[PDB]
Every structure is written in structure tokens, then in C-alpha cells.
Ligand SMILES: CC(C)C(=O)Nc1nnc(S(N)(=O)=O)s1
Ligand SMILES: CC(C)C(=O)Nc1nnc(S(N)(=O)=O)s1
């Protein structure tokens with residue numbers, strides 16, 4: 554089964570998921586000088602005030618904070634998007650060391666981690682149908698650098714001890730994802746894919762320019778999670794990131810000059 558190890562990591566995924574070598578794969582390097590400002594791009598509309606978190610799950614690849622997506626409670630609109638995209642979950646990708654961990658890079662720079670807030674286009678009714686469509690998902694990507702603590706992340710950090718191993722979940726209600734955003738909503742956007750199998754080419758990527766700061770202690774706690782299930786040899790959940798993929802016939806657009 555796919556993972557992030559030497560024998561099942563990103564270089565192997567194409568054997569089970571040939572789209573891994575497709576025309577709109579993610580992540581990519583964001584070459585800031587080549588991205589073009591698009592004055593027709595609208596400000597992002599992030600409406601998370603009514604978000605209803607439910608649960609946090611270690612799925613053996615990352616941890617997912619899941620939301621009630623049975624109504625328009627937490628939605629992403631505007632920016633490059635047509636229509637309304639409902640928040641379903643967020644998760645992170647992170648490194649074994651502070652110098653790596655992000656999936657997208659900025660002028661080849663790797664951040665310590667990257668947050669993905671996953672949303673699906675409500676015109677397709679459910680996430681499973683949305684992933685079959687070229688405009689099915691909008692993923693809001695936010696870089697993490699190590700510095701000051703992010704207070705809004707701490708409730709996530711503190712529950713990780715209860716979901717150490719693959720398949721463990723915990724109740725995770727009343728978490729406000731607004732506490733994970735940076736000040737600015739300036740962004741880059743391009744058409745891409747899920748960065749994990751099945752690697753479907755269904756994502757409008759919206760990557761914020763401003764990283765959030767998290768403390769070394771916060772990211773250290775991410776690195777104490779396990780890829781393995783309970784009672785199996787311990788494999789630290791680190792370096793669960795896919796490297797940058799060829800941009801191919803795509804232009805990255807910037808919302809800002
Ligand atoms: C892309 C594929 C493997 C996939 O993940 N499909 C899902 N369909 N519903 C989901 S759920 N429980 O988050 O709402 S995931
Ligand atoms: C579980 C389901 C709802 C889901 O969200 N699946 C994703 N698989 N890769 C994603 S990513 N790293 O491109 O944001 S999200």
C-alpha cells in the first residue's frame with residue numbers, strides 16, 4: 554500500500570496510480586517571479602464562523618480534522634472559484650526537520666509544514682462525486698514556518714497523544730479553523746490534483762502567500778505521531794509530503810502585485 558517510505562513513497566505511486574505522471578499534478582514549485590498577477594481574481598471569501606468540527610483521525614498518512622459538511626456551514630468562495638465550496642476536513646504535511654515538510658515550495662524554498670483545508674464544490678452534492686470533476690475541490694494551502702507558537706493550533710497539538718497510531722480517532726468538536734489562518738489572504742492559484750493517491754486532477758489550489766508561524770514544540774508534537782497501527786513497530790509520522798511535480802502546461806496566477 555502507498556505511503557511515504559523508500560519502498561512505497563511518491564516515486565512508486567505511478568505504478569498503482571498512473572495519473573501520478575499526469576498533466577495537472579500537485580504540488581508544484583511556485584516561482585514567484587513567473588506567477589502573474591491577475592487583477593480579475595477576486596478576494597477570497599473564507600466563511601468559517603459556523604464551522605462544526607467533529608473528529609480528529611490518524612489515517613496512517615496524516616491526521617484529519619473532520620467537519621460536518623452536510624450543510625453550508627464553513628465555505629470557501631470567491632478568489633478563482635465559481636460557486637460555493639464546503640469545508641470537509643483539514644490536515645497537514647510536515648517534515649522530520651524544520652527545513653522540509655511542505656508540499657508546495659516557493660522559489661524552491663520548503664517550509665516546515667503545510668496545512669490543507671479541503672473543500673468540495675456543492676454543485677456536485679458529495680465529496681466522492683466532486684473528486685471526479687475538474688473543478689470538484691478547492692484546497693486552501695497555508696505554509697507553516699517554525700517561530701512563535703500559533704495559539705489556534707494548540708488544541709490540535711494537545712489531542713495528538715490520543716490518536717498516536719493509524720486508525721485512532723478522537724472527538725474534536727468546537728474547533729475554530731479561523732485560528733489557523735494568517736492575517737493576509739493574498740494567494741497564488743493554479744489547477745492541480747490531490748497530492749495523495751488517488752491523485753485525482755480535481756483541485757483548484759489556492760496557496761496563501763503569508764505563512765503562519767508555529768513553535769518548535771508544536772511541530773515536534775506532530776512528529777511524535779505514528780504511521781503504524783497500535784501494536785506494530787513504531788514508524789514516526791514524518792516527511793508525509795509529496796515533492797513538487799512538473800508544472801507542464803499551467804500558469805500560476807497571483808492575487809496580488
Ligand atoms: C479520493 C478518494 C479515495 C476519497 O477519499 N473519497 C472520499 N469520499 N468521502 C470521503 S469523507 N468520509 O471524507 O467524506 S473521502
Ligand atoms: C479524505 C478526503 C476527504 C480528502 O480530503 N482527501 C484528500 N486527499 N489528498 C488531499 S490533499 N493533500 O491534496 O489536500 S485531500
Ligand SMILES: [Zn+2]
Nearest residue numbers: 645646669748
Ligand atoms: Zn494535503
